[PDB]
Amino acid sequence: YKCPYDFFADRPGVRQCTACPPLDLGGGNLVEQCTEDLGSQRCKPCSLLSKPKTARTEQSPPPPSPSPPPPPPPSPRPPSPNPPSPRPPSPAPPSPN
Ligand SMILES: *[C@H]1O[C@H](CO)[C@H](O)[C@H](O)[C@H]1O
Ligand SMILES: *[C@H]1O[C@H](CO)[C@H](O)[C@H](O)[C@H]1O
Ligand SMILES: *[C@H]1O[C@H](CO)[C@H](O)[C@H](O)[C@H]1O
Ligand SMILES: *[C@H]1O[C@H](CO)[C@H](O)[C@H](O)[C@H]1O
Ligand SMILES: *[C@H]1O[C@H](CO)[C@H](O)[C@H](O)[C@H]1O
Ligand SMILES: *[C@H]1O[C@H](CO)[C@H](O)[C@H](O)[C@H]1O
Ligand SMILES: *[C@H]1O[C@H](CO)[C@H](O)[C@H](O)[C@H]1O
Ligand SMILES: *[C@H]1O[C@H](CO)[C@H](O)[C@H](O)[C@H]1O
């Protein structure tokens, strides 16, 4: 996105735009600086800008769309297998003679 008005970015690939700091003229007096147009890295003083703040004719961009939802918890595990069923009865010993 372009840096908005009164914001500038110099180093490329910058995460967030930075506001123009006030310009200290010396002796403790500071004149704040306003960017001329969108996406500019030059902080011109607000008194000397060719285009006044009123002359800006850009519809302010829509606010951030909401952040996505969270990832569902780990689904449960399949039921554990059951033990081997009981062995069948053993054969009765041979009947007497
Ligand atoms: C929102 O930003 C625009 C510039 O796109 C303009 O400065 C408006 O005045 C502001 O409300
Ligand atoms: C979230 O809202 C903005 C407007 O603020 C825009 O419509 C996006 O498309 C939406 O995802
Ligand atoms: C989650 O993301 C939105 C953009 O979709 C926005 O940056 C919020 O500030 C963040 O928490
Ligand atoms: C098991 O359940 C979770 C939610 O508890 C999620 O829907 C997974 O996709 C499903 O496999
Ligand atoms: C029995 O086996 C299941 C998998 O089918 C799971 O690991 C349970 O934790 C275990 O008790
Ligand atoms: C014998 O019993 C076990 C559990 O008691 C299991 O159900 C087997 O399938 C059955 O043959
Ligand atoms: C006697 O024989 C049966 C199967 O023929 C089974 O193994 C019993 O455990 C055994 O006592
Ligand atoms: C004689 O005895 C054996 C077991 O001792 C068996 O029950 C036969 O059926 C019976 O005839």
Q: Which of 80, 82, 87 to mutate to test the pocket of ligand 6 (most atoms within 8 A of CB)?
A: 82
What span, in angstroms and rounded, lies between the C-alpha atoms of 40 and 9?
Answer: 7
DSSP state of 38: S
Looking at the DSSP bridge assignments, the partners of residue 8 are 18
**Cβ(25)–Cβ(48) below 8 Å:** no
Reading phi first (left if > 0) and then psi (alpha if -120 to 50, else beta), residue 46 is in: alpha
Method: cryo-EM
- Residue identifier of the C-alpha nearest atom 11 of ligand 6: 85
Q: Resolution in angstroms, to 1 decimal, for this deposition?
A: 3.1
**Cβ(4)–Cβ(38) below 8 Å:** yes
CA of 65 to the centre of ligand 2 (A): 5
